[PDB]
């Protein structure tokens, strides 16, 4: 069909919509509140204990940056994907773990201090050494340098906005732990309005509902990526003979990945008109990995009942 750009187009106002800015700022505030509530239920003792024993940190790093980009490259090679799709899936695989991974860790409730130290060290290591692995694994795709286009200020900004609420919660619990129920109720209400806000988003913010015309095989690989990540994390944890507490948290931290940086790099590298439904692909990937997370939540609770 020769080489033509997709008919998918974005509204001119979408670049600086006040509604989009309001959604971004309320999402940032929401992440701040949920991170504060999440770091409330941790203490520095286990943080220091897990930092002194970096075996879990080492296994998480070797799973996230050693095999995950390799399996992303292999999956792109075997499914005969296009250059843009292969680059997108490779960047998604190379991404470090996100904060929603820590939210699912709270849902599973296993070794939260290890989870937070894992995610902060993963983000730091990503910042340090993601462009080199991206250049190594992107031979034949995007001959451009791309080193100066991966976000750097965004990474440190996210790291600070994650660390500060956690430290605030830890120091609040350590020094004066008498206002627990109020902040937990605030967590419940922030979660409720988060459900309301995500419903509002999915209703009146997506637009151009043509994601179903997206290629089924890229849907299949976006489906398989979180599942294979979860399975690889679980087995790699199992064969290194640690305690049973860390299995689920390390496996599901390895499986989950961030998608904001992938969207930013795809948007800055290519025009919106060139990219078709792959622009909405990160949203689909995040939604489906959340679905897998909920499925494993249900499986874990069903197992623990029996």
């Amino acid at each position: 069909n020769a080489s033509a750009p997709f008919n998918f187009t974005l509204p001119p106002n979408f670049g600086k919509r006040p509604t989009d800015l309001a959604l971004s700022v309320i999402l940032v505030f929401m992440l701040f509140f949920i991170m504060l509530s999440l770091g409330c239920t941790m203490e520095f003792s286990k943080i220091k204990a897990h930092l002194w024993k970096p075996k879990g940190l080492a296994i998480a790093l070797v799973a996230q940056y050693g095999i995950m980009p390799l399996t992303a490259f292999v999956l792109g090679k075997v499914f005969r994907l296009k250059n843009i799709e292969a680059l997108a899936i490779l960047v998604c695989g190379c991404s470090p773990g996100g904060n929603l991974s820590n939210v699912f860790s709270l849902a599973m409730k296993g070794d939260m201090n290890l989870s937070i130290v894992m995610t902060t060290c993963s983000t730091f290591c990503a910042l340090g050494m993601m462009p080199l692995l991206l250049y190594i694994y992107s031979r034949g795709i995007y001959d451009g340098d791309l080193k100066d286009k991966v976000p750097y200020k965004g990474i440190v900004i996210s790291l600070v906005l994650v660390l500060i609420p956690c430290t605030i919660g830890i120091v609040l619990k350590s020094k004066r732990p008498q206002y627990m129920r109020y902040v937990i109720k605030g967590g419940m209400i922030i979660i409720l309005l988060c459900s309301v806000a995500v419903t509002v988003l999915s209703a009146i913010n997506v637009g151009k509902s043509i994601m179903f015309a997206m290629t089924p095989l890229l849907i299949a690989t976006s489906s398989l990526m979180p599942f294979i990540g979860f399975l690889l994390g679980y087995v790699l944890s199992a064969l290194f003979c640690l305690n049973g507490r860390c299995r689920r948290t390390v496996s599901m931290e390895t499986g989950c990945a961030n998608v904001q940086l992938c969207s930013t790099i795809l948007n800055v590298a290519f025009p919106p008109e060139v990219i078709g439904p792959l622009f909405f692909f990160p949203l689909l990937y995040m939604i489906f990995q959340l679905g897998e997370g909920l499925l494993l939540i249900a499986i874990f609770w069903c197992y623990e009942k029996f």
Partner: antibody
Amino acid sequence: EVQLQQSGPELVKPGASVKMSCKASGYTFTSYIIHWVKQKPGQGLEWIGYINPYNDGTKYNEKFKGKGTLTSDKSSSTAYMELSSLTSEDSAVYYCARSYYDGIPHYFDYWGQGTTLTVSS
Amino acid sequence: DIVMTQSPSSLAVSAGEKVTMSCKSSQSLFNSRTRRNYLAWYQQKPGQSPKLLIYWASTRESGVPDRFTGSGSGTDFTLTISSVQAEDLAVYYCKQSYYLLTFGAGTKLELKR
């Protein structure tokens, strides 16, 4: 359809800086990249480099590192190419071509009328 | 780098004869991930800018006559005209874009006497 419009013939001294203008207004200028091809008389085509107007990303051929300089203007939908280092043998015909670029430039479907440059006294 | 070599580089044919040029490139410029076989054939009539004929070394650009067929894989490629006419006399380059944009030496078409 769309056509690629060249600046026109240019006559320049051996020591000077010459800028070439290539204009195309038939599509979204940021969706495609613009290449430059140098053709000495009867010596065949030779690639120079391409520029991506969306992010102002430029890639150069091996020999054109010293003199190759590509700049683009989104507002004017024009691509500019500058040499700033000229010799008597540098005179040739330069073409600007448009190619779709996803990860690798595919093929130059459309070409300009060409620019003839002469270097002498 | 990749260097493109064309063997004939010069030939003269009559109306009925077929030319069947061939340029062997340097190595196997076939993409395993996407079975596209990156290659493009261009035609440049004298005093005119080059015109694209074949892309992906197998697919012909719309608007070209059906007589222009290109078949090849790996390193060997061939463009055939079959029933060549008087307006097909030009220079063809079989440009490649697998790794770096390099053009071939070129072939010249003439008329026999």
